[PDB]
Design a protein around this nucleic acid. Structure first.
Ligand SMILES: [Mg+2]
Ligand SMILES: [Mg+2]
Lengths: 126, 264, 200, 230
RNA sequence: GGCUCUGUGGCGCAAUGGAUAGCGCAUUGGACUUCUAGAGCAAUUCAAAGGUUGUGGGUUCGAAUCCCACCAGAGUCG
């Protein structure tokens, strides 16, 4: 299930980041596909940012959404957040909405939390 | 140099006479629930206008007490105390000391009283407006602004704030305060806060162990390390320590107590 | 005597009997549903402190010293945290990784409190004079946020400290034997409401 | 122009008319640190003076709204002999109202009752009365505050929530604060655990966190950070 | 041994104005937000109840208020 997965072929072919980074990316992919049950997911690489992004789709017509997996060790400066926002905008290519990406923090315990970083001002919905 | 030369407001005889008819009931703030989004309604404007008008009505009032109840205090610049000129009232059970057969108050105590209207502070035979008292008493030579804010905040609740005068292992906070006492500089205990129930029979001579021991510090100041906290909890003795934090007029309190894990 | 795999810088247990034992032994590790992911702290704890778990790599057993080396390289803090993970484990707690908040560990007593932890810890190793470098920098804003979020979840923020004597050089940290010469110091940090605290 | 008393880096507003002007025109709320004359012993609501954050003082000074002026030295002793004829002449008039109404009165004025001259100060250089000049933290917080004020907001201290500026879409009297805007330099490394704690607290209080950052060329970028339940 | 100052709701106090007792905290209850029952600090808000005004005497169209005595408490002067 873990070692023998078809997506691991592209995960190894990307060769971006450390083995821990690709492993937490695969862990988030499994979390989203199994429990969250999204329609489709993919393993896109960002060599310039040295990141793995998961471009998934919650509903069959909801549209492309981005999830970035990072461990608790990773350091996020605000410049890194702006760069990730611009990369997500390029991936989605939808100027109709502002930059927005979900950050997936993962621990060695394989426990995962998410936070939706959106550029600009977002009113807290009821 | 250009000078703005501002001026204050003095109350007339009718205003002074009507100021002592005030009811103590407070004007309620915000009038219940607060609207989420400013949708530009014609009704939210009236609510905002009413709330701000009540705020101005509450801020336009001044303290007017009869001359009989006003103790004629007298600030001493050089000495640093506020030696009274008439016998002190109820506030003498818990505030101020006596010296040379004369009642005398610390800067922060007298400033709190003047703000409360208990006394009538003079200076060079010229009565002081609260603004001049704030400018004159609070300084580095005496109680600072944060210390006075914590003092007044605790006093308005009933507290008796005094002024403070001097396999692995498992240690404790008071374990070590001799080699650590030499390294000083930073947070220091200021106030011997008692409790409100102790007001009834307080003895300013032998008051017993204080309820807490306040350390006052700003909210932008660095958080104390284990060394500073251990030194402070050794100076405080058995009395629990409490850190008071002030951020631009808002006061919070946090206590760093010792702990031991129960054997599950 | 419990085989596992240190595949891709994480300990994973496959065998059904082994994972059944590990879940029956005070809920160690997190699953999927069903291979059991085991954190570095719990893995090294069951390798050294009990010896039940056996971690194999490159088809050969690994000495505990090599496990310590690998885990320290793949996680620099794993030394300090592990000591705390030992110090809260010998006393019968169930320290789970608790980075659902800004804290490291969540301590629970027993089975009837199923994950209903009542303490959140902030591990940081310090020196003998208590002038150690901050493993996680603190400020009254950060402490206020942590205390408020812990109160909202009905817990109590902790501030565990690990004290290393000057005689114990860092180079000896290659083995958990230094754990025998590390003191501990716990400091609860709770709010003091001036209105309520008027005797009772 | 209005006047603000700046002593030892503390900016206070004594006259209630200035408080009304600030709240109505310039939308700079502030916090009250004095005690109410109406009810002396309480903490629910306070009175004058109003206390201004150093960012608020600098913003108000720069937009030509209030003329910051340092507190004068205690040399008012020479100006006397006028209050004695002031308190006693009113005493004779005061017994006329009290007798027809069927021991004297004293006013403890919050603001100074005499016209006093005080020299102004420039906030662009650090001194013993405006030490906030040149501090990187003050520069960062003021840079955030000016841009969150231009767009139209009410900002207040938010140390209790772990942020730096509670941001509200309207007057805080009538509108709950929306954001818990922090202030991070572009290069500073944000701690992930602190970010998680702040975000969870924001969701609990129902107030979106903002990671405000001023760019080197000069512009404030905001990165809102909500919960992401999936 | 005198002198001075106090005693009001569970706690801290206001009413000094001679026209009869109110304010905050605490307690209880409602509304709202959030969390896994609890928590809520400008995500909080509102409402209710709570009284031998230390005791006796006296002046007065009325005494918490003014005066005297006593009881208790604090400080101070031997
Ligand atoms: Mg009683
Ligand atoms: Mg009482």
């Amino acid at each position: 299930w873990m070692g023998t997965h078809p997506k691991y072929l592209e995960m190894m072919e990307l060769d971006i980041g450390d083995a821990t980074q690709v492993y937490v990316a695969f862990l988030v992919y499994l979390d989203l596909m199994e429990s969250k049950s999204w329609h489709e997911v993919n393993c896109v690489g960002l060599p310039e940012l040295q990141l793995i992004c998961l471009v998934g789709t919650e509903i069959e017509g909801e549209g492309l959404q981005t999830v970035v997996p990072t461990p608790i060790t990773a350091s996020l400066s605000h410049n890194r957040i702006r760069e990730i926002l611009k990369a997500s905008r390029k991936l989605q290519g939808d100027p109709d909405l502002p930059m927005s990406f979900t950050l997936a923090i993962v621990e060695s315990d394989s426990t995962i939390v998410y936070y939706k970083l959106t550029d600009g001002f977002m009113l807290p919905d009821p | 140099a250009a000078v703005e030369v501002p001026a204050g407001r003095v109350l007339s005889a009718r205003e002074l006479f009507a100021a002592r008819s005030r009811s103590q009931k407070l004007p309620q703030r915000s009038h219940g629930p607060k609207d989420f989004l400013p949708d530009g309604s014609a009704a939210q404007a009236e609510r905002l206008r009413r709330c701000r008008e009540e705020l101005w009505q509450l801020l336009a009032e001044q303290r007017v007490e009869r001359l009989g109840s006003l103790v004629a205090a007298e600030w001493r610049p050089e000495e640093g105390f506020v030696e009274l000129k008439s016998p002190a009232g109820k506030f003498w059970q818990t505030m101020g000391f006596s010296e040379q057969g004369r009642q005398r108050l610390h800067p922060e105590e007298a400033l709190y009283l003047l703000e409360c209207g208990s006394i009538h502070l003079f200076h060079q035979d010229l009565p002081l407006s609260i603004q001049e008292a704030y400018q004159l008493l609070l300084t580095d030579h005496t109680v600072t602004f944060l210390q006075y804010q914590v003092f007044s905040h605790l006093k308005r609740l009933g507290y008796v704030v005094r002024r403070f005068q001097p396999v692995l292992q498992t240690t404790h906070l008071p374990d070590g305060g001799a080699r650590l006492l030499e390294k000083s500089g930073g947070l220091e205990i200021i106030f011997d806060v008692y409790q409100a129930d102790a007001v009834a029979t307080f003895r300013k001579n032998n008051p017993g162990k204080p309820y807490a021991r306040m350390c006052i510090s700003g909210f932008d100041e660095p958080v104390p390390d284990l060394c500073s906290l251990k030194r402070l909890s050794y100076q405080s003795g058995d009395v629990p320590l409490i850190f008071a934090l002030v951020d631009h007029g808002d006061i919070s309190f946090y206590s760093f107590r010792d702990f031991t894990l129960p054997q599950d | 005597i419990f085989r596992a795999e240190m595949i891709n810088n994480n300990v994973i247990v496959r065998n059904a009997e082994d994972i059944e034992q590990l879940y029956g032994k005070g809920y160690f590790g997190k699953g999927i549903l069903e291979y059991l992911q085991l954190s570095l702290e719990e893995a090294f704890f069951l390798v050294y402190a009990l010896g039940c778990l056996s971690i194999y790599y490159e088809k050969e057993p690994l000495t505990i010293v090599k496990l310590w080396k690998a885990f320290t390289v793949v996680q620099p803090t794993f030394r300090t945290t592990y000591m705390a993970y030992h110090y809260f484990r010998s006393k019968g707690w169930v320290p789970k990784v608790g980075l659902k908040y800004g804290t490291d560990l969540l301590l629970a007593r027993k089975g009837p409190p199923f994950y209903a932890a009542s303490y959140s810890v902030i591990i940081e190793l310090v020196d003998d004079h208590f002038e150690g470098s901050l493993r996680r920098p603190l400020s009254w804003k950060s402490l206020a946020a942590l205390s408020r979020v812990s109160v909202n979840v009905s817990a109590e923020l902790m501030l565990c400290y690990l004290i290393k004597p000057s005689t114990m050089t860092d180079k000896e940290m290659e083995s958990p034997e230094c754990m025998k010469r590390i003191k501990v110091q716990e400091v609860i940090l709770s709010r003091w409401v001036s209105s309520r605290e008027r005797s009772d | 122009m209005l006047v603000v008393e700046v002593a030892n880096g503390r900016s206070l507003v004594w006259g209630a008319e200035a408080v009304q002007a600030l709240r109505e025109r310039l939308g700079v709320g502030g916090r009250t640190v004095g005690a109410l004359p109406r009810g002396p012993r309480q903490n629910s609501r306070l009175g004058l003076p109003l206390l201004l954050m150093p960012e608020e003082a600098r913003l108000l000074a720069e937009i030509g709204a209030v003329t910051l002026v340092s507190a004068p030295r205690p040399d008012s002793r020479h100006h006397s002999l006028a209050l004695t004829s002031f308190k006693r002449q009113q005493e004779e008039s005061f017994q006329e109202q009290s007798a027809l109404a069927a021991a004297l009165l004293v006013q403890l004025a919050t603001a100074r009752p005499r016209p006093v001259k005080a020299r102004p100060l420039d906030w662009r250089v650090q001194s013993k009365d405006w030490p906030h000049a040149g501090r990187p933290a003050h520069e960062l917080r003021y840079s955030i505050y000016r841009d969150l004020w231009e767009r139209g907001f009410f900002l207040s201290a938010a140390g209790k929530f772990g942020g730096d500026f509670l941001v509200a879409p309207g007057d805080p009297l009538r509108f709950a604060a929306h954001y818990i805007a922090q202030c991070w330099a572009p290069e500073d490394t944000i701690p992930l655990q602190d970010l998680v704690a702040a975000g969870r607290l924001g969701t609990s209080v129902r107030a979106t966190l903002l990671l405000c950052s001023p760019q080197p060329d000069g512009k404030v970028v905001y990165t809102s950070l909500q919960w992401a339940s999936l």
